[PDB]
């Protein structure tokens, strides 16, 4: 039961800093991508520092695909919030794009080619999960 | 004692790494050795599946440790072992002779034959500390 050595991260994940990262298998709407990470006892990507940003941009340099992050905005009236209920801080980046009240279930942000964008949560895209590294 | 270093992908008995630059087969092999690794070697259908998963989101060609001098030589990995019969089927330029031989790479889930002289990204692998 108590770990013989215990790896920082599970197999197929990527270890960097105090975190483990897992790249989605395919395209799913935001709500589902969220369910996928929660089921693994993790969460959607939350960039909380420059090092995280550097790592992700590099780990996603090989792709042109959109990767959902755990950031959403119910509608224009509301603010951009991460999954843990905390606000979006300025310094890191800006989410360009539309926040439409016609969108069925709010607006969600994704990362693609280094820049962050806004989109109808209902659409499908790849995602990135994250958990603290086992140390 | 961590299985693999940061940025590597721990899967089964090994660690895996996507290269930072696009080079010819020779230079790519040099780069993997420099990292105490070798070019990717697929020992089964499970290896291949894991690879495609990791490369799903990319349309780039990734060199692997498979090659031969010309169509008269069979496909062999760097270590000398042959290509297992039922793993995959190498497509593309399989009937040509290149001064620097024909090398293989994975792109879009499929394996192709190409002039070793050409550029491509690569996948390096090494044993994990278990």
Curated annotation (Swiss-Prot), chain B:
Protein name per its UniProtKB record: Oxidized low-density lipoprotein receptor 1
Domain C-type lectin residue range list: 11-125
Subunit structure: Homodimer; disulfide-linked. May form a hexamer composed of 3 homodimers. Interacts with HSP70.
Effect of residue 43 to Q: Does not affect glycosylation state
Subcellular location: Cell membrane; Membrane raft; Secreted
Tissue expression pattern: Expressed at high level in endothelial cells and vascular-rich organs such as placenta, lung, liver and brain, aortic intima, bone marrow, spinal cord and substantia nigra. Also expressed at the surface of dendritic cells. Widely expressed at intermediate and low level.
Job description of the protein: Receptor that mediates the recognition, internalization and degradation of oxidatively modified low density lipoprotein (oxLDL) by vascular endothelial cells. OxLDL is a marker of atherosclerosis that induces vascular endothelial cell activation and dysfunction, resulting in pro-inflammatory responses, pro-oxidative conditions and apoptosis.
Phenotypic consequence of residue 69 to N: Does not affect binding to acetylated LDL (AcLDL)
Domain notes: The cytoplasmic region is required for subcellular sorting on the cell surface.
Shown chain mapped onto the complete sequence: 141 to 270 of 273
Disease: Independent association genetic studies have implicated OLR1 gene variants in myocardial infarction susceptibility.
Consequence the record notes for mutating residue 100 to A: Impairs binding to acetylated LDL (AcLDL)
Organism: Homo sapiens
Effect of substituting residue 89 to N: Does not affect subcellular location but displays a reduced affinity for acetylated LDL (AcLDL). Abolishes binding to acetylated LDL (AcLDL)
Effect recorded for residue 124 to S: Abolishes sorting into the cell surface and binding to acetylated LDL (AcLDL) while increasing N-glycosylation
Factors inducing expression: By inflammatory cytokines such as TNF, IFNG/IFN-gamma, IL6/interleukin-6 and by pathological conditions such as hyperlipidemia, hypertension and diabetes mellitus. Up-regulated in atherosclerotic lesions, by oxLDL, reactive oxygen species and fluid shear stress, suggesting that it may participate in amplification of oxLDL-induced vascular dysfunction.
Signal peptide: none
Result of altering residue 32 to S: Abolishes sorting into the cell surface and binding to acetylated LDL (AcLDL) while increasing N-glycosylation
Extracellular side: 1-130
Covalent S-S links between cysteines: 4-15, 32-124, 103-116
Record site: Not glycosylated: 43
Post-translational modification (record): The intrachain disulfide-bonds prevent N-glycosylation at some sites. N-glycosylated.
